[PDB]
Write a protein that binds this DNA or RNA. Structure first.
Ligand SMILES: [Ca+2]
Ligand code: NA
Length: 276
DNA sequence: TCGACGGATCC
DNA sequence: GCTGATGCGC
DNA sequence: GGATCCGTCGATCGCATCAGC
């Protein structure tokens, strides 16, 4: 059945108003999506920090609109080493960070342009586009390697500041995170492996699935639909885009939103509200 | 994802 | 620029 | 032996690149 995201709760569990509005979007071609009036949708949602994945854009092919984006002056970008047009993530924010880094500190995993780290006063923000195990599970073995190393990079970070991790994590965590769980229990993003890696990341770092913390039993809540087979219209999809945060931050959690209506990609955008 | 495909097996 | 083709994504 | 069950297994869509001239 269809899904309707409830209104934005902009109040913390202790009655404080939200201060920070992070918005993440797997854009699936930075150039297509801009052409598709995506940056329009950004201008109206008005985030403080905007994280994007699947940029598929070279450092010199980025449209000019982006730099001119108001309210998001500090703009950091990572694209892969030698695979032109693959992968790519960005992070834009109204305020300027204290330190920004790229990658997770592992040569094997920092070559496809997938991780940006943005340290602020009161927390650290990590945005990432995770490797898909692949059609035919061709890269599932490597995705076990990435999950393990990403796990311990975040455990590290977490020990020093409150962490917020967002973006496309390329796994549906539980049968409630996708419309066709039985049809997909051995395809990319729903294998016993990928799902055990998500749960291990949650127990080890540790982190909470922000959206599920609030709506732990609401189904058909998705962030991705295959372009094929007019699937978005039928609401057959996968929740692949998360905000994961340290338990420390749960008193600051006001709301975790899924922007189902916003068009421009095969992912829809997601939006986090914090009282900081 | 979706159907067309099997091949199993059920009355 | 314009045509073919192939790669990668759930 | 007819009609169901239930596991494969190609191909829709879209956004990129690359070869060639
Ligand atoms: Ca391929
Ligand atoms: Na009978």
């Amino acid at each position: 059945a269809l899904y309707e995201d409830p209104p934005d709760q902009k109040t913390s569990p202790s009655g404080k108003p939200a201060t920070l509005k992070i918005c993440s979007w797997n854009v699936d071609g930075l150039r297509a999506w801009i052409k598709k009036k995506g940056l329009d949708w950004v201008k109206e949602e008005a985030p403080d920090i905007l994280c994007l994945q699947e940029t598929k854009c070279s450092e010199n092919k980025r449209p000019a609109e982006l730099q001119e984006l108001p309210g998001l002056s500090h703009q950091y970008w990572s694209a892969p080493s030698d695979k032109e047009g693959y992968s790519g993530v960005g992070l834009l924010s109204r305020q300027c960070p204290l330190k920004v880094s790229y990658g997770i500190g592992d040569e094997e995993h920092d070559q496809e342009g997938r991780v940006i780290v943005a340290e602020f006063d009161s927390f650290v923000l990590v945005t990432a586009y995770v490797p898909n195990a692949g059609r035919g599970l061709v890269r599932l073995e490597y995705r076990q390697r990435w999950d393990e190393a990403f796990r311990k990079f975040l455990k590290g970070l977490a020990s020093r500041k409150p962490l917020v991790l967002c973006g496309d994590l390329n796994v549906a965590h539980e049968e409630i995170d996708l419309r066709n769980p039985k049809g997909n229990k051995k395809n990319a993003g729903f294998t016993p492996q990928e799902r055990q890696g998500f749960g291990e990341l949650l127990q080890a770092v540790p982190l909470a699935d922000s959206f599920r913390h609030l709506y732990p039993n609401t189904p058909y809540a998705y962030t991705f639909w295959t372009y094929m087979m007019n699937a978005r219209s039928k609401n057959v999809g996968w929740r692949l885009d998360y905000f994961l945060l340290s338990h420390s931050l749960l008193p600051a959690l006001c709301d975790s939103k899924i922007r189902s209506k916003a068009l421009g990609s095969d992912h829809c955008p997601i939006t986090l509200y914090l009282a900081l």
